[PDB]
Amino acid sequence: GRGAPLAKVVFRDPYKYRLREEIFIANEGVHTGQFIYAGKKASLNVGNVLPLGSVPEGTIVSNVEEKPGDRGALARASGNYVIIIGHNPDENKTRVRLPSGAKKVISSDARGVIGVIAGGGRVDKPLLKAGRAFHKYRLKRNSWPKTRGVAMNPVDHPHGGGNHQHIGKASTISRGAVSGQKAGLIAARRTGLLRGSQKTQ
């Protein structure tokens, strides 16, 4: 269910003699037996997790946290990364660049592992047959196949019905609608083929 491989990075408990084994997300370039460092005073090497208040600008990191304590929220899929584009010494803020392109500022006390996540180029191969789409999606949920709502009955989808295959009304349904109406393009600011740019954010 994940394009990225895991990692059995095992730690030691500093308060009782045992071996606590944890599961990370494997970056690209790590290997079995690498000394993975975890701390604020740790060095800046690929595979180590560091707080964002102790790294300079431009460090390509991943598995960055929103708030310090949620054990890894943002940038977890295969082949993704965020870019620290600026710091703030006052009130310990750190401005990062999310993979969607959303420049959002977070706390400097949040953590993040150095480097891009292993598994890049996964969606660059044409997943040709439906059998490869079957064995992919049967390990996730019951969301495959996807029947077109025009082809089904008027009781089954708001677009279906009629003597032809047509929607009938506008596919742009507002955000302030209720369930049962939210089909097609939910609250679209723009529609049609992208013949412009990425001017804002």
Partner RNA sequence: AGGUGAAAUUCUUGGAUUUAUUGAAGACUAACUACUGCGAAAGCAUUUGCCAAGGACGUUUUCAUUAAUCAAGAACGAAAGUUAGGGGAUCGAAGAUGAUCAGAUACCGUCGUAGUCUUAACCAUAAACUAUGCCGACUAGGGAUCGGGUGGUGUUUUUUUAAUGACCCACUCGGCACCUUACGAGAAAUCAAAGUCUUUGGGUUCUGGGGGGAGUAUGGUCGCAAGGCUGAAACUUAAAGGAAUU
Partner RNA sequence: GAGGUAAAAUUC
Dihedral sign for Cα atoms in the order 192, 195, 200, 201: positive
Task: Work out what residue 128 binds among Mg ion, RNA, another protein, none; the CB cut-off runs from 5 to 8 Å by kind.
Answer: another protein
The answer to whether 1 contacts RNA (rule: CB under 7 A) is no
The answer to whether 86 contacts another protein (rule: CB under 8 A) is no
Name the minimum Å distance from CB 116 to Mg ion: 11
- Out of 9, 38, 42, 46, the residue judged to bind another protein by CB under 8 A: 46
The answer to whether 133 contacts another protein (rule: CB under 8 A) is no
Interatomic CA distance for residues 147 and 133, integer angstroms:
15
Q: Side chain identity at 162, as an amino acid letter?
A: G
The answer to whether 179 contacts Mg ion (rule: CB under 5 A) is no
Angle made by CA atoms 57, 80, 84, in degrees to the nearest 5: 15
List the x/- string, 62-101, binding to Mg ion by CB under 5 A. --------------xxx-----------------------
Which region among 127-135, 139-147, 148-156, 190-198 touches RNA (by CB under 7 A)? 190-198
**Burial classification of residue 58, based on how many CB atoms lie within 10 Å of its CB (0-12 exposed, 13-18 middle, 19 or more buried):** exposed
Distances (CA, A) of 53 to 25, 39, 136, 148, 178: 22, 12, 39, 49, 43
| Cβ proximity of 62 and 49 under 8 Å | no
Of 87, 85, 109, nearest to 98 (Cα)?
85
Q: Which stretches of the chain bind another protein, using CB under 8 A?
A: 3-5, 7, 26-33, 43-46, 56, 58-60, 78-79, 81, 114-116, 118-122, 124-126, 128-129
- List of residues contacting Mg ion (CB under 5 A): 2, 4, 76-78, 142-143, 146, 148, 160-162, 165, 194, 196
Name the site residues for RNA (rule: CB under 7 A): 85-86, 101, 124, 194-199
